[PDB]
Design a binder for these strands. Structure first.
Ligand SMILES: [Mn+2]
Ligand SMILES: [Mn+2]
Lengths: 165, 295, 302, 929, 295
DNA sequence: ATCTTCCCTATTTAAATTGCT
DNA sequence: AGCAATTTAAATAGGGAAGAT
């Protein structure tokens, strides 16, 4: 599948990962990831890396995405579209912490608050140490951290560039 | 085999490989690998080169030098010359240094022409970048590369001293290194001691650039002891200064393409000499040095 | 010769910016300035510290600040006054056996370029670190001695030529080379979008404390004066292996990258001022760097 | 330089060396090259002729002397190029080589019989403590002793009997006792704590009967019964026939063992032990892979079971036999014939033609080079070594920097790195700055050299860089601690490499007076061991005391007695070569060394005394030494200065004394322009090195180059307050010195730091000796023990230097050269000589120099410790941040002339001063505040 | 890599005749038609001249130039009467030290400094005479040689131009040629085309001093296109200017002795190696040309 | 062509043994 | 004890072929 590169440059004044996350947000908000364009990162060791890599099967051109990232052009670099027979596809993994599932136990099982604390008191509290990005969510008005990890390649992708199922 | 290199306008730097050069029936010929003899016309060549697998004889040497055809010994490829004599005005009638050589000396001496020629060598280095456009490399007309080019142009034009020009030259060279690293998805930092593909491929490509710049400086009789940017104690600094023109325009994209596809060194050598033969890079350096020294 | 540097030698700060107060406007309704309020949301979570494992059962009710634009204004306005002051060669704590030699060694400093890069860092948006990111429109208005200057598209990394920055740079270099002061009221209008989250400067919190303090003057989000002063002097493109302009430090040192560019390679300020008072020939760029440090100021004694 | 290279080589190693030797010389045909080349061309030809591979057979002739000989080519004894050399040349009553072969073979087949107990099996498998209650060498010794008590141990079937715990395994049979000591001490020597035994035991067996299990083998002792229940699975074919053939070899040769002397037995058993550890470590290093199970000896890196004990014993036997063969039948690789040595010395080196008075065909030589400093002593030592032929020597010197100085002299005169090997085993970070290309200095560690044939018998092909430089060096310019381990070690196989090094190489020890008393004892032990194999000892010390020169001669004489009776040759005596800058004297001395040595000493004294007095010392009368230092500085600046500028050296004793003198002089109000330096040893890597290079370049007074390293325009007193680090190995030239008295050799050495380079005589006085050491105000009972030979057993009756020294005296080496034992309680010189003859005596004692009987034990390596210092922990400065309780401080900034800063490095603090903060400072390093 | 021998400390020099020079197992060796392959010490060779009937491969030049050996050919303009172009390849692949070019050209461009440098090199003739004495020929201290040396120094002191210099050369050389000839009892006319030994040995020594002078020039980086002596009959450049320091001191006494003592060409060639390495003439010329450029 | 590596190819040296004087 | 005959074998030289530049 042919692919394109979006490398964050000159982001020292601002962290590199903040520019990476803003690149993800601007690629989300102006379309791009309809259902078939996916992201991958060549340098996840402990950081998310500074290269966004889009491996759309139909083909991503330079002009559409450089018009999309007109806001990041001061510290971005776009390579010409190259080809890759295999891309290392990542997916979204989310975390739950206490009250999250407590409200689920309010609205699914219909139990009271104290017994919902009782079934979950000694449980939960997982801690994801995977490399991540920090995403502005616009439909739900709060900003969060989204965790990415390696999984088998899927035909369909989300609106963010990660695998489905 | 037989190889033609245009150098100035009409004289041709002949390169002969796997052949035995001697005198047959009163004129210089050479037996090739296929057992077929080939003669050489004295009128159209001034530089004749002896690549790998090549032997020349004494009366062939004498008759070649008596016809104005001055011979040099080179490593196979034609741009890695290790042995020659010095160009004169005429080979037989007199012994004077070439006008180009004398002009270079005078320009180097007076401090103002040396500064103006240092600015000019960097102007033509930016020209070289645009002139020699590659396919696999980055776009020279791209906005980041053009911003680097205009930054270098402003910095060279506004500078009044050599150490400012050295800082600006290093900024431009390593900025193009950073741009090509941003292309080829790698953390590239220029060090000669590294054993990775990009650094060692750039190192041996730089050695090829030094060889072709040495041939271009020799072919107009320019000596190897008058550097423009580099210091007076730098041995062969003019070879490095002339090779700087094509290090970041030709050697750098070819070397990064070679490390990207990962092929071996001899076929990188054949790619470098193919780019030198196709676009007449030595002729570009010859005309560059003529325009620098003539002023 | 061997003019040894005074141990009390210091220079005053010559680029004094105010705190960058932050307001919410529209793009075509630029006069209605509503102050951006730092909200603060509570977060429930147990404490986890290395020194107190016995206290991890209960506590640490933390309340972390945040600052967004309101949902009716799409433009963030940043107001601050940058005050350039002259006689950068006067040492305030130093004296004049060394500082007077510095005066007579840095008199050939082209202040034009120094000032250009200062006003270019003012205008292009170096003072707007994380909130110029993702903005579809950047604007800078500079008011100086009843003169208004408008800047729209200046790429901040390279210092390209525009006659507007140059115009102000003239009076700024005339101040910095001579005696006096000049004040630039700088208002930045960046169109981020409707309700986009803005970025004030951060107070230092402890390893524990709370997650993040945003900078408040009288309840309103703002950014630090020294942080803007970091932005203005971010003009250093003259160290060896100079890729991007860094803040002019006496050691060329950036904390956030974990490396120092001018330390340990004979291009630090101190070796250059000792070379200046011992009188070896400086180039224009390192002398401009030394004058930029003296504009920045700081104690140089040892 | 005209050379001729001939090739003896077979193979195409007559072909791929022909390319390199035909790159540098013309071909005269018949595999012979001949032509003109430079000395650097000789070095390049050596470097690319040796590195081309193994089997190079190259002889080079410069004029008619052999330049070099690649390989073990016999080449020339008289004529050059022999005909065919086949076999069976001499075949004598070798006797002692058959004795060493029998002892090593019999012991090596019995050295690891004690790993067969169940405790060692579960130790290798790993279900118990890896430290045994009794070490397996002692268990194998118990096995052999029980078998010898039961059956006739020399001619019987083996069968391992039921053994119990034995406190002692040493009986009376001298040969059995030799085999038992080889078995038990194949890992470590036994250590005897007993004071009466240490007082009285001298003989071979009579000391060996005191070596019990409690001397290190008996660790804790709770599983002794499991440590002595043993299986007998060794009874196989090849092990039994190997044991039988070696036992019968010993049986046939042990008749010459009783005709040996004590000295022989000790040296022969030392050689046997060295070959036994060589074979044991050689077989333990390599992995053999195959095993017959049910019993095991060693473990691999993965901890798996390997090297079963039958084939382990057989492999250790053959490797030790081969070790012995190559160390006893080696023609070692010698250095090049340096052509810049053999010509005449001119002017002040004209005494170096004394080598033309020495015989070139003597098998042994004991040089006592009493020449003064600045005359080229080490060059004269190399000349004396090259007078006998090609050079093979170990230049063992104190300090790293003195080895660097001798290496730089060897490099710039004639010696390349194909013959020289500078060894400093610490990897110091003192680099040369300014210009790497324009250095022409900083002798480094490469050693292109030539790998000797002895590397194949060492463990895992010797080692990497360091031991290859040790063993294979023709000339080994080394720090001395890489050579004093030849005499023996506590634990491990660190004895074998300097032992085999000093076996085939000469020993050259320069300025042995700067070493400690125990250091000089173990150095004379090394001299005795070097003389045990016929090598030549060159001692080069000007201020030699008769006692020292005598005990070094007696060590060489006992060693040459070992070597003479070892080759069954009648002992004619030792060729002693007395040498100084006024003459030479070569005598065959077998007895009456003392009268000849004192006559040479008196002749050197009369050749020193009619020369002009260069160091006139006045002992001050001022009691308080602080103001004595003040008044003496004022007086010697007003008398001794070069146009108002004078250089003074305040030699004090210890570090806090140095900072006390510095802090007094900095606060001292005077019209003199005092500029103070601190020059002690407690300093950080950077700071210390910087002081050294500066001081060496400002106190150089052979030319006027220093006028540019100091401000000589203004009249200034450049004062350097230093500890004994200035009086050892420093080429410094002060205008005058003020000395705190600690020892008389300190007085002579700090006289040697004044007018060292000039020849102008002083008029009035150039040395002012202090009335008392500063320890008088801290300890009036004993004050000269720090950096001196006063001690608790040798106390001066008076500490006044008017009582114990001359008030006006011309200080030279004469007082140290003469030697006086009477009136040692009220004179410093006779106190010095007393200690020197009362510690380095002709006895064996236990910490003495003739040590016999104790070499078998671990006693001379425990109670006589080389470089015996205090605990010494190292506070390390890491990038400006100190490690321990250091606390950087600020100096007085009154008169500091030069102060170099430091960021890395380490300071050596005694554990006593670790209690408090050492308070490191940039000007003066360590103190008590 | 090592120090690779200083080129002043190379002692072997060759002029090969009627051979094929090649590489056989990495060996610079010349093969004759009788089947004899003689090796050359290429890491110790100063120069290899090539006479008529000679031939050399590429690889032999490659590992002679890497070892710093200057290779010239004795034909072409090698008839020595015009002395226009003796075809002389140098190893310029090695980047030479530059400062001797800088001080040399500072004095070259300045014509008054060139005139003074010419006078110093003309005084080097008599310096060579005094330093290099011969015990089988003319004593330097006799009345004729002392008189003509005094006349030469007092003429070159008051000299004004290079035309005046050209004339002083005529006198010194021609009359030293003659003075030897009258003491060797031979009517002698210098002729490069003459067959007598007194001229064939002189031309062989001319080629030998050509090789020594050119190796001394190249060592410092100095070329040939910067001569100090300009004249009608002085075609050939700086190599003959350096070489005629040591005609009448070295080459001419050896050639005259050889011819008189009936030496063969081979032994004259060897006598030339013996004098050029026993007195260390290459280091003499190299250090003396450092004295010439200096500032 | 040139030069290198390797495989024949057998031609060419060195050792080894042993009666014989 | 030197040698001779005579075997035995290790190695040296060379030519042809093929693969590199
Ligand atoms: Mn063991
Ligand atoms: Mn063992």
């Amino acid at each position: 599948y042919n692919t394109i590169s979006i490398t964050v440059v000159d982001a020292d004044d601002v962290g590199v990962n903040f520019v990476v996350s803003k690149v993800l947000s601007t690629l989300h908000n102006k379309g791009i990831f309809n259902g078939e364009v996916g992201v991958t990162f060549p340098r996840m060791d402990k950081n998310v890396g500074d290269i966004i890599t889009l491996f759309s099967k139909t083909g991503v051109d330079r002009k559409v995405l450089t018009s999309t990232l007109n806001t990041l052009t001061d510290f971005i670099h776009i390579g010409k579209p190259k080809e890759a027979d295999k891309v290392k596809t990542y997916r979204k993994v989310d975390t739950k912490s206490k009250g999250k599932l407590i409200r689920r136990c309010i609205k699914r099982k219909g139990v009271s608050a104290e017994t919902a604390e009782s079934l979950y008191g000694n449980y939960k509290g997982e801690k994801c140490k995977l490399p991540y990005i920090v995403v502005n969510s616009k439909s739900t008005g709060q900003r969060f951290s989204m965790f990415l990890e390696e999984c088998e390649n899927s035909e369909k992708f989300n609106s963010y560039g990660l695998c489905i199922v | 085999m037989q190889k033609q290199i245009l150098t100035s306008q009409k004289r041709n730097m002949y390169i002969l490989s796997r052949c035995k050069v001697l005198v047959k029936n009163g004129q210089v010929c050479h037996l090739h690998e296929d057992g077929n003899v080939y003669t050489v016309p004295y009128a159209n060549t001034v530089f004749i080169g002896l690549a790998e697998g090549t032997s020349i004889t004494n009366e062939a040497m004498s008759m070649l030098a008596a016809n104005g055809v001055i011979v040099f010994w080179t490593k196979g490829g034609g741009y890695d010359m290790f042995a020659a004599d010095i160009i004169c005005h005429l080979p037989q009638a007199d012994y004077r240094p070439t006008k180009y050589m004398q002009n270079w000396v005078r320009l180097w001496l007076d401090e103002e022409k040396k500064l103006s020629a240092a600015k000019e060598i960097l102007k033509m280095r930016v020209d070289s970048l645009s002139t020699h456009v590659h396919d696999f490399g980055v776009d020279v007309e791209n906005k980041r590369v053009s911003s680097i080019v205009n930054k270098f142009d402003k910095g060279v034009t506004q500078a009044t001293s050599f150490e400012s020009l050295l800082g600006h030259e290093g900024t431009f060279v390593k900025s193009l290194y950073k741009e090509y690293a941003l292309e080829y998805e790698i953390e590239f930092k220029r060090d000669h001691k590294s054993a990775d593909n990009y650094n060692k491929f750039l190192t041996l490509g730089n050695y090829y650039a030094y060889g072709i710049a040495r041939s271009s400086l020799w072919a107009l009789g320019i000596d190897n002891s008058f550097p423009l940017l580099h210091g007076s104690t730098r041995r062969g600094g003019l070879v490095f200064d002339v090779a700087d023109i094509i290090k970041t325009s030709i050697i750098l994209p070819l070397a990064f393409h070679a490390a990207d596809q990962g092929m071996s060194n001899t076929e990188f050598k054949r790619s470098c000499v193919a780019y030198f033969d196709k676009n007449d890079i030595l002729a570009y350096l010859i005309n560059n040095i003529k325009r620098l020294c003539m002023e | 010769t061997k003019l040894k540097a005074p141990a009390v030698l210091a220079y005053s700060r010559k680029i004094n910016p105010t705190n960058a107060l932050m307001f919410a406007v529209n793009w075509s309704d630029r006069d209605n300035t509503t102050a951006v309020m730092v909200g603060t949301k509570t977060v429930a979570g147990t404490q986890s510290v290395r020194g107190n494992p016995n206290d991890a059962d209960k506590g640490n009710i933390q309340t972390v600040n945040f600052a967004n634009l309101p949902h009716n204004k799409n433009t963030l306005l940043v107001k601050y006054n940058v005050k350039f002051v002259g006689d950068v060669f006067k040492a305030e704590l130093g004296g004049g056996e060394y500082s007077n030699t510095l005066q007579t060694a840095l008199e050939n400093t082209d202040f034009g370029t120094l000032a250009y890069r200062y006003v270019y860092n003012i205008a292009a948006g170096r003072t707007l670190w994380r909130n110029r990111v993702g903005a579809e429109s950047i604007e800078t208005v500079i008011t100086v001695n009843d003169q208004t200057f408008t800047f729209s598209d200046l790429l901040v990394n390279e210092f390209d030529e525009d006659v507007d920055v140059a115009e102000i740079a003239d009076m700024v270099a005339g101040v910095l080379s001579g005696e006096g002061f000049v004040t630039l009221k700088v208002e930045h209008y960046m169109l981020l979008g409707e309700g986009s989250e803005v970025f004030p400067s951060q107070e230092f919190v402890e390893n524990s404390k709370l997650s993040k303090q945003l900078f408040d003057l009288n309840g309103q989000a703002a950014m630090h004066d020294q942080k803007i002063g970091n932005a203005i002097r971010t003009i250093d493109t003259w160290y060896e292996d100079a890729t991007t302009p860094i803040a002019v430090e006496p050691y060329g040192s950036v904390v956030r990258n974990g490396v120092a560019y001018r330390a340990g390679n004979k291009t630090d300020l101190f070796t250059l001022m000792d070379g200046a008072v011992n009188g070896k020939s400086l180039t224009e760029e390192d002398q401009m760097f030394v004058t930029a440090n003296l504009i920045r100021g700081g104690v140089f004694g040892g | 330089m005209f050379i001729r290279i001939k090739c003896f080589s077979k193979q195409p190693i007559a072909k791929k060396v022909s390319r390199e030797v035909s790159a540098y010389l013309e071909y005269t045909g018949n595999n012979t090259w001949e032509g003109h080349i430079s000395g650097q061309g000789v070095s390049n030809l050596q470097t690319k002729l040796i590195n081309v591979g193994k089997g190079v057979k190259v002889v080079c002739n410069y004029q008619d002397k052999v330049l070099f000989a690649i390989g073990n080519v016999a080449m020339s004894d008289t004529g050059s190029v022999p005909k065919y050399t086949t076999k069976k040349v001499y075949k004598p009553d070798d006797s002692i080589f058959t004795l060493k072969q029998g002892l090593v073979g019999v012991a090596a087949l019995w050295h690891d019989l004690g790993k067969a107990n169940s405790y060692f099996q579960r130790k290798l498998r790993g279900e118990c403590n890896p430290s045994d209650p009794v070490r397996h060498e002692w268990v194998s010794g118990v096995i052999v002793s029980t078998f010898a008590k039961g059956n006739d141990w020399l001619s019987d079937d083996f069968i391992i009997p039921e053994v119990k715990h034995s406190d002692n395994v040493f009986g009376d049979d001298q040969v059995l006792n030799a085999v038992l000591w080889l078995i038990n001490t194949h890992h470590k020597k036994g250590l005897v704590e007993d004071p009466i035994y240490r007082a009285t035991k001298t003989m071979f067996t009579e000391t060996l009967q005191c070596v019990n299990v409690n001397g290190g083998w008996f660790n804790y002792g709770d599983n002794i019964d499991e440590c002595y229940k043993i299986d007998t699975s060794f009874i196989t074919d090849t092990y039994v026939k190997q044991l039988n053939r070696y036992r019968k070899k010993l049986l046939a040769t042990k008749h010459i063992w009783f005709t040996l002397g004590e000295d022989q037995k000790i040296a022969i058993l030392q050689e046997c032990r060295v070959a036994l550890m060589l074979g044991d470590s050689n077989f333990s290093s390599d992995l053999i892979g195959g095993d017959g199970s049910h019993l095991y000896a060693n473990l691999d890196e993965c901890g798996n079971l390997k090297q079963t004990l039958t084939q382990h014993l057989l492999g250790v036997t053959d490797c030790a036999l081969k070790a012995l063969f190559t160390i006893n039948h080696h023609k070692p690789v010698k250095a090049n014939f340096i052509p810049t040595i053999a010509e005449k010395g001119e002017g002040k080196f004209a005494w170096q033609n004394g080598v033309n008075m020495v015989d070139s065909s003597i098998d042994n030589m004991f040089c006592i080079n009493m020449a003064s400093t600045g005359k080229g002593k080490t060059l004269a030592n190399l000349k004396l070594l090259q007078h006998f032929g090609n050079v093979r020597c170990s230049f063992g010197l104190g300090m790293v920097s003195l080895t660097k100085q001798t290496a730089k002299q060897f490099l710039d005169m004639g010696v390349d790195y194909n013959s020289a090997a500078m060894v400093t085993g610490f990897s110091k970070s003192r680099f040369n700055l300014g210009s790497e290309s324009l250095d022409q200095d900083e002798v480094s560690v490469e050693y292109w050299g030539q790998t000797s044939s002895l590397s194949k018998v060492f463990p895992n092909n010797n080692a990497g860089f360091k031991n290859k430089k040790l063993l294979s060096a023709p000339i080994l310019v080394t720090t001395t601690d890489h050579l004093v381990k030849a005499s023996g070690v506590k634990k491990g196989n660190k004895q074998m490499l300097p032992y085999v090094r000093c076996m085939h190489s000469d020993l050259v020890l320069d300025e042995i007076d700067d070493y400690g008393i125990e250091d000089m004892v173990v150095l004379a032990r090394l001299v005795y061991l070097t003389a045990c194999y016929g090598n030549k000892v060159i001692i080069s010390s000007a201020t030699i005391t008769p006692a020292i020169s005598n005990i070094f001669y007696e060590a060489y004489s006992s060693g040459y007695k070992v070597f003479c009776a070892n080759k069954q040759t009648t002992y004619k005596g030792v060729n002693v070569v007395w040498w100084d800058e006024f003459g030479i004297k070569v005598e065959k001395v077998t007895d009456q060394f003392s009268n000849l040595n004192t006559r040479f000493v008196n002749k050197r004294i009369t050749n020193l005394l009619e020369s002009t007095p260069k160091h006139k010392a006045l002992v001050v009368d001022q009691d308080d030494n602080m103001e004595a230092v003040k008044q003496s500085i004022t007086t010697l600046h007003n008398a001794h200065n070069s146009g108002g500028v004078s250089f003074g050296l305040i030699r004090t004793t210890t570090i806090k004394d140095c900072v006390a003198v510095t802090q007094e002089l900095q606060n001292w109000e005077t019209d003199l322009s005092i500029k103070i330096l601190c020059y002690h040893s407690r300093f950080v890597g950077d700071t210390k090195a910087q002081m050294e290079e500066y001081l060496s370049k400002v106190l150089n007074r052979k030319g006027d180059e220093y006028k540019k390293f100091v401000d000589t325009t203004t009249p200034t007193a450049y004062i350097v307050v230093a500890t004994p680090v200035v009086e050892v190995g420093r080429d410094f030239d002060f205008d005058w010195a003020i000395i705190e008295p600690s020892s008389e050799r300190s007085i002579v050495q700090c006289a040697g730091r004044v007018l060292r380079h000039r020849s102008s005589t002083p008029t009035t006085h150039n040395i002012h000796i202090l009335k008392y050491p500063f320890k008088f105000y801290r300890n009036s009972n004993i004050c000269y023990d720090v950096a001196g030979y006063e001690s608790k057993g040798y106390k001066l009756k008076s500490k006044n230097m008017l009582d114990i020294y001359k008030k006006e005296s011309i200080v030279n080496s004469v007082n140290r050269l003469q030697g006086d034992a009477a009136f040692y309680t009220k004179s410093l010189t006779a106190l010095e000589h007393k200690v020197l003859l009362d510690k380095l005596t002709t006895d064996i004692a236990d910490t003495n120099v003739f040590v016999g009987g104790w070499q078998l034990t671990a006693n001379p390596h425990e109670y006589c410790k080389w470089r015996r210092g205090t605990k010494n922990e190292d506070l390390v400065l890491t990038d400006g941040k100190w490690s321990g309780n250091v606390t950087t401080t600020k100096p007085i900034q009154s008169k500091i002339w030069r102060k170099w800063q430091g960021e890395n490095g380490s300071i050596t603090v005694p554990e006593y001063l670790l209690d408090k903060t050492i308070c490191y400072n940039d000007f003066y390093g360590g103190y008590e505040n």
